Design a protein around this ligand. Structure first.
Ligand SMILES: [Pt+2]
Ligand SMILES: [Pt+2]
Ligand SMILES: [Pt+2]
Ligand SMILES: [Pt+2]
Ligand SMILES: [Pt+2]
Ligand SMILES: [Pt+2]
Ligand SMILES: [Pt+2]
Ligand SMILES: [Pt+2]
Ligand SMILES: [Pt+2]
Ligand SMILES: [Pt+2]
Lengths: 271, 271
């Protein structure tokens, strides 16, 4: 139950700092309407311990939605900033590399023998991008109608590369060249049509059935702290030490604490 | 290079999970003094790899020695729990079965013709127990002077089980009776004098010239996870998915990775 627990824990940190500047700045990052910013600041006074009623009627409806949207949207911007580092890349790429292996051999090409991929690796099996509605079907379509050009592009690139000839150090190079090509297929698929599939993923993560992962938590908390990299250098807006606990275990002193119960139950814990 | 690589892999796993108690439990299994537990604790911070200086002045001296010791003592513990299952049994028994063929021939007994053993079988020729200092010498002595009693014991058991006359099924039954006797010889020789030769193997495994086998790897990892069978039921203390890569190849998601380069060089791999 991540965004709820994040929200609750974020309210304890605000009421604890008693600063309208940090409070207002973070309200801004969540883009909250001033009507809602009033309901929350009422809670920031009267310190003791938030009621079940303050949570169900004030914190959950306002900061639940807003933190999920901030996590969603900030997933997108991290991807655009440096896409090969993101989980979404390597998850989607693992699928693109598996579809192309199947479509390459269907197209009677020797390039299939360069992909070792069974689409069963547990690191990728449950990636949320695979549950985006219609996405994988559009991925199959994309892999089919793009495979002739891919083979073309591999042939082109291979012939430029020729120069010993180990007959196993020369399938190194087929593999690497093909991997770079497919890594570009992965990003292009997401960036097509002013980021149609990328926005499709954003909307999926704004859906309420989608469990926030520990992955999305870290995006959220970087968005909340406003962590950036800007020309002049990495700049922050707040430093908020966060600690995750796992099945009660514990790991500077932390200002926000969540307990992660085997990735099923999120609870926040007041420091 | 196994204990070093196991140790490195164990610190990546530790640092990654960030639980004081999982950490402290495993330090307990490794029986480390609080002095050394602290030098490691420093290393499990500022995770956002480890330097060669951290490895060779901190991780290797502390965990290298402790994991070897743990692997060794736990070799002994498994043997005592169920000795015929351990490879130490199967290797020592193959030697004992070969020495007894030689000694029974020397004592001009027809029993030597029931033993099928050239001592050449490669599965057993490289057995670490054979390299234990003095051990095979003590074994010959033991076999030479125990042989009259063994002939004695085979004759006794043979008389008792006589009940017919299949011949094709007479060498069978002599063979089996003798094999059981020799298997008891094998264990006795190790448990004699309060487990003197068994402890001599333990100390051999502790001497740092002894290359960690792949077999010893799995003992250590069962000890680290505190695997046991207890009467309430086989119960664990941790589950730590380990994976071995073999000459770079790959096999749920793994928390420790070692690469085993054809049993000459061990390296760990951050997941
Ligand atoms: Pt939630
Ligand atoms: Pt994390
Ligand atoms: Pt992170
Ligand atoms: Pt973090
Ligand atoms: Pt940067
Ligand atoms: Pt080693
Ligand atoms: Pt192994
Ligand atoms: Pt094993
Ligand atoms: Pt058992
Ligand atoms: Pt294993």
């Amino acid at each position: 139950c991540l965004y709820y627990a994040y929200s609750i824990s974020l309210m304890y940190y605000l009421r604890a700092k008693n600063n309208v500047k940090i409070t207002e700045d973070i309200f801004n990052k969540l883009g909250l309407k001033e009507e809602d910013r009033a309901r929350l600041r009422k809670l920031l006074s009267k310190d003791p311990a938030f009621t079940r009623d303050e949570i169900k009627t004030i914190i959950e409806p306002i900061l639940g939605r807003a933190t999920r949207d901030l996590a969603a949207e900030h997933t997108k911007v991290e991807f655009k900033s440096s896409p090969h580092d993101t989980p979404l890349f390597s998850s989607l790429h693992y699928a693109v590399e598996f579809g192309f292996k199947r479509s390459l051999q269907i197209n009677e090409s020797e390039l299939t023998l360069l992909i070792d991929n069974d689409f069963s690796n547990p690191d990728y099996t449950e990636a949320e991008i695979y549950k985006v509605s219609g996405l994988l079907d559009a991925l199959q379509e994309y892999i089919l109608t793009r495979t002739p050009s891919v083979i073309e592009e591999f042939n082109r690139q291979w012939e430029n590369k020729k120069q010993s000839l180990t007959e196993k150090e020369i399938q190194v190079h087929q593999a690497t060249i093909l991997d770079n090509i497919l890594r570009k297929e992965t990003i292009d698929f997401l960036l097509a049509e002013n980021e149609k599939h990328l926005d499709e993923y954003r909307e999926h993560l704004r859906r309420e059935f989608v469990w926030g992962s520990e992955e999305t938590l870290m995006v959220l908390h970087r968005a909340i702290q406003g962590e950036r990299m800007v020309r002049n250098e990495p700049v922050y807006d707040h430093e908020i030490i966060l600690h995750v606990h796992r099945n009660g275990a514990s790991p500077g002193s932390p200002e926000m604490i969540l307990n992660n119960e085997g990735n099923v139950h999120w609870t926040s814990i007041i420091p």
